Amino acid sequence: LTPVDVITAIKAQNAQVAAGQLGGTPPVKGQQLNASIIAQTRLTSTEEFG
Amino acid sequence: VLYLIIVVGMAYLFVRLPSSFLPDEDQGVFMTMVQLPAGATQERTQKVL
């Protein structure tokens, strides 16, 4: 392994992703849900980084 | 001495008289708001409006 690989991995699997909404605009007639979506959250504990 | 009580009634009045800052005037244009339960859709609020 190389330090560049470590940096690439830590960049890749510790990130923030914007997904969107379920039932966004413009909608189709006959819709009744306007929830949001959560995709990925930054790591918090040291074990997760481990 | 009678004039004396003319003073004290003033205090009695000061309790009766409430306090505000600025009256509400007739501007001729007003507003109305509509708020719906969470998770609703645009069609429902459009129909209500």
Added chain:
Amino acid sequence: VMPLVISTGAGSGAQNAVGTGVMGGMVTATVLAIFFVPVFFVVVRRR
């Protein structure tokens, strides 16, 4: 301020408040001070 005290048009509240607050003070300030200030003057001069 007689027209002010009786108004229903635009900006009526402010003129109503000002007119009433002034006239109510003045009606008693003109009808009672004449019969009161001589007594006050003689009392304050005696002591």
